[PDB]
Protein backbone atom coordinates (compact mmCIF):
# COMPACT_ATOMS: atom_id res chain seq x y z
CA UNK A 1 0.00 0.00 0.00
CA UNK A 2 2.91 2.34 0.78
CA UNK A 3 3.63 2.38 -2.99
CA UNK A 4 1.62 5.62 -3.17
CA UNK A 5 4.30 7.26 -1.03
CA UNK A 6 7.08 6.08 -3.32
CA UNK A 7 5.22 7.20 -6.45
CA UNK A 8 4.77 10.66 -4.99
CA UNK A 9 8.48 10.64 -4.17
CA UNK A 10 9.28 9.60 -7.73
CA UNK A 11 7.28 12.47 -9.17
CA UNK A 12 9.06 14.79 -6.74
CA UNK A 13 12.43 13.50 -7.89
CA UNK A 14 12.12 13.44 -11.68
CA UNK A 15 9.90 16.50 -12.14
CA UNK A 16 6.81 15.12 -13.85
CA UNK A 17 4.17 17.83 -13.51
CA UNK A 18 0.78 16.51 -14.53
CA UNK A 19 -1.22 17.79 -11.53
CA UNK A 20 -4.12 15.39 -12.12
CA UNK A 21 -2.90 12.23 -10.40
CA UNK A 22 -0.85 14.21 -7.88
CA UNK A 23 -3.79 16.01 -6.28
CA UNK A 24 -5.77 12.76 -6.07
CA UNK A 25 -3.03 10.81 -4.33
CA UNK A 26 -2.27 13.81 -2.13
CA UNK A 27 -5.80 14.25 -0.85
CA UNK A 28 -5.85 10.50 -0.23
CA UNK A 29 -2.57 10.62 1.72
CA UNK A 30 -3.31 13.98 3.39
CA UNK A 31 -5.67 12.05 5.71
CA UNK A 32 -5.06 10.08 8.95
CA UNK A 33 -2.09 8.29 7.35
CA UNK A 34 -0.38 11.63 8.04
CA UNK A 35 0.12 10.72 11.69
CA UNK A 36 1.20 7.27 10.52
CA UNK A 37 3.75 8.66 8.06
CA UNK A 38 5.72 10.74 10.54
CA UNK A 39 7.60 14.02 10.06
CA UNK A 40 7.49 13.51 6.26
CA UNK A 41 4.12 15.01 5.33
CA UNK A 42 5.41 18.57 4.98
CA UNK A 43 7.09 17.97 1.62
CA UNK A 44 3.87 16.30 0.50
CA UNK A 45 2.04 19.51 1.33
CA UNK A 46 4.55 21.66 -0.54
CA UNK A 47 4.06 19.34 -3.50
CA UNK A 48 0.29 19.05 -3.46
CA UNK A 49 -0.18 22.82 -3.16
CA UNK A 50 1.52 23.56 -6.48
CA UNK A 51 -0.19 20.79 -8.45
CA UNK A 52 -3.46 22.08 -6.98
CA UNK A 53 -2.70 25.60 -8.22
CA UNK A 54 -2.14 23.85 -11.55
CA UNK A 55 -5.52 22.10 -11.42
CA UNK A 56 -7.47 25.29 -10.68
CA UNK A 57 -8.97 24.29 -7.32
CA UNK A 58 -7.33 26.85 -4.98
CA UNK A 59 -9.36 25.46 -2.03
CA UNK A 60 -6.80 22.91 -0.83
CA UNK A 61 -4.08 25.55 -1.21
CA UNK A 62 -4.97 27.46 1.94
CA UNK A 63 -5.40 24.32 4.03
CA UNK A 64 -1.93 23.13 3.07
CA UNK A 65 -0.45 26.60 3.45
CA UNK A 66 -1.93 27.15 6.89
CA UNK A 67 -0.70 23.79 8.11
CA UNK A 68 2.73 24.87 6.89
CA UNK A 69 2.33 28.25 8.58
CA UNK A 70 1.38 26.78 11.93
CA UNK A 71 4.32 24.37 11.89
CA UNK A 72 7.05 26.68 10.49
CA UNK A 73 6.08 30.21 11.59
CA UNK A 74 9.12 32.28 10.63
CA UNK A 75 9.84 30.36 7.45
CA UNK A 76 10.85 31.67 4.04
CA UNK A 77 9.63 28.85 1.78
CA UNK A 78 6.01 29.26 2.85
CA UNK A 79 6.45 32.95 2.08
CA UNK A 80 7.37 31.93 -1.46
CA UNK A 81 4.24 29.79 -1.53
CA UNK A 82 2.18 32.83 -0.52
CA UNK A 83 3.81 34.77 -3.34
CA UNK A 84 2.78 31.97 -5.68
CA UNK A 85 -0.79 32.13 -4.39
CA UNK A 86 -0.80 35.89 -4.96
CA UNK A 87 0.50 35.75 -8.52
CA UNK A 88 -1.95 33.00 -9.47
CA UNK A 89 -4.77 35.38 -8.48
CA UNK A 90 -2.83 38.17 -10.20
CA UNK A 91 -1.55 40.32 -7.34
CA UNK A 92 1.83 41.14 -8.84
CA UNK A 93 3.07 44.22 -6.97
CA UNK A 94 2.11 42.61 -3.65
CA UNK A 95 4.18 39.57 -4.56
CA UNK A 96 7.06 41.82 -5.60
CA UNK A 97 7.00 43.56 -2.23
CA UNK A 98 7.00 40.11 -0.61
CA UNK A 99 9.95 38.77 -2.59
CA UNK A 100 11.91 42.01 -2.20
CA UNK A 101 11.25 41.81 1.54
CA UNK A 102 12.50 38.26 2.04
CA UNK A 103 15.45 39.15 -0.16
CA UNK A 104 15.88 42.30 1.93
CA UNK A 105 16.11 40.21 5.12
CA UNK A 106 18.16 37.55 3.29
CA UNK A 107 20.16 38.81 0.27
CA UNK A 108 21.67 35.41 -0.58
CA UNK A 109 18.28 33.84 -1.30
CA UNK A 110 17.61 32.80 -4.89
CA UNK A 111 13.97 31.67 -5.07
CA UNK A 112 12.70 35.23 -4.72
CA UNK A 113 14.58 36.31 -7.83
CA UNK A 114 13.41 33.24 -9.73
CA UNK A 115 9.80 34.13 -8.90
CA UNK A 116 10.22 37.80 -9.76
CA UNK A 117 11.34 36.53 -13.15
CA UNK A 118 8.35 34.21 -13.52
CA UNK A 119 6.17 37.23 -12.81
CA UNK A 120 8.00 39.41 -15.33
CA UNK A 121 7.50 36.64 -17.89
CA UNK A 122 3.83 36.02 -17.11
CA UNK A 123 3.06 39.65 -17.94
CA UNK A 124 4.22 38.92 -21.49
CA UNK A 125 7.53 40.74 -21.35
CA UNK A 126 10.61 38.70 -22.25
CA UNK A 127 13.44 41.08 -23.15
CA UNK A 128 13.77 42.45 -19.61
CA UNK A 129 13.41 38.99 -18.07
CA UNK A 130 16.45 37.88 -20.05
CA UNK A 131 18.70 40.67 -18.82
CA UNK A 132 17.42 40.16 -15.26
CA UNK A 133 18.26 36.47 -15.52
CA UNK A 134 21.72 37.29 -16.85
CA UNK A 135 22.32 39.81 -14.07
CA UNK A 136 21.43 36.95 -11.75
CA UNK A 137 23.72 34.50 -13.58
CA UNK A 138 26.40 37.18 -13.34
Amino acid sequence: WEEMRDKMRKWREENSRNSEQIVEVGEELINEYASKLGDDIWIIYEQVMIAALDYGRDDLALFCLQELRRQFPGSHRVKRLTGMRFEAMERYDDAIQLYDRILQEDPTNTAARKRKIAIRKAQGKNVEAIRELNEYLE
Binding site: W42, F72, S75, H76, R77, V78
Partner: protein, 49 residues
Protein backbone atom coordinates in the same frame (compact mmCIF):
# COMPACT_ATOMS: atom_id res chain seq x y z
CA UNK B 1 38.33 -17.98 60.61
CA UNK B 2 39.34 -16.91 57.12
CA UNK B 3 42.42 -15.05 55.97
CA UNK B 4 43.10 -12.79 52.99
CA UNK B 5 46.81 -12.59 52.17
CA UNK B 6 46.21 -10.36 49.13
CA UNK B 7 43.07 -8.41 49.91
CA UNK B 8 40.43 -10.55 48.18
CA UNK B 9 41.07 -9.50 44.60
CA UNK B 10 38.28 -11.70 43.15
CA UNK B 11 35.25 -10.50 45.12
CA UNK B 12 33.56 -7.47 43.99
CA UNK B 13 34.38 -4.84 46.55
CA UNK B 14 32.25 -5.73 49.62
CA UNK B 15 31.36 -1.99 49.39
CA UNK B 16 29.62 -1.71 46.03
CA UNK B 17 27.15 1.09 45.34
CA UNK B 18 24.49 -0.60 43.21
CA UNK B 19 22.25 2.48 43.21
CA UNK B 20 24.56 4.95 41.49
CA UNK B 21 25.07 2.56 38.60
CA UNK B 22 21.33 2.07 38.11
CA UNK B 23 20.89 5.86 38.33
CA UNK B 24 23.45 6.37 35.54
CA UNK B 25 22.33 4.05 32.75
CA UNK B 26 18.84 5.53 32.78
CA UNK B 27 20.33 9.01 32.68
CA UNK B 28 22.21 8.06 29.53
CA UNK B 29 19.29 6.28 27.88
CA UNK B 30 17.05 9.30 28.38
CA UNK B 31 19.80 11.68 27.28
CA UNK B 32 20.13 9.60 24.12
CA UNK B 33 16.42 9.70 23.33
CA UNK B 34 16.51 13.44 24.08
CA UNK B 35 19.43 14.24 21.80
CA UNK B 36 17.93 12.04 19.11
CA UNK B 37 14.60 13.85 19.00
CA UNK B 38 16.46 17.16 19.55
CA UNK B 39 18.70 17.03 16.45
CA UNK B 40 16.26 15.60 13.93
CA UNK B 41 14.17 18.67 14.71
CA UNK B 42 16.87 21.34 14.54
CA UNK B 43 18.01 19.87 11.24
CA UNK B 44 14.53 19.68 9.75
CA UNK B 45 14.07 23.31 10.81
CA UNK B 46 17.35 24.19 9.11
CA UNK B 47 15.74 22.80 5.96
CA UNK B 48 12.47 24.77 6.14
CA UNK B 49 14.08 28.01 7.28
Amino acid sequence: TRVYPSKQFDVLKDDYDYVLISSVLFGLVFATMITKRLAQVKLLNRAWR
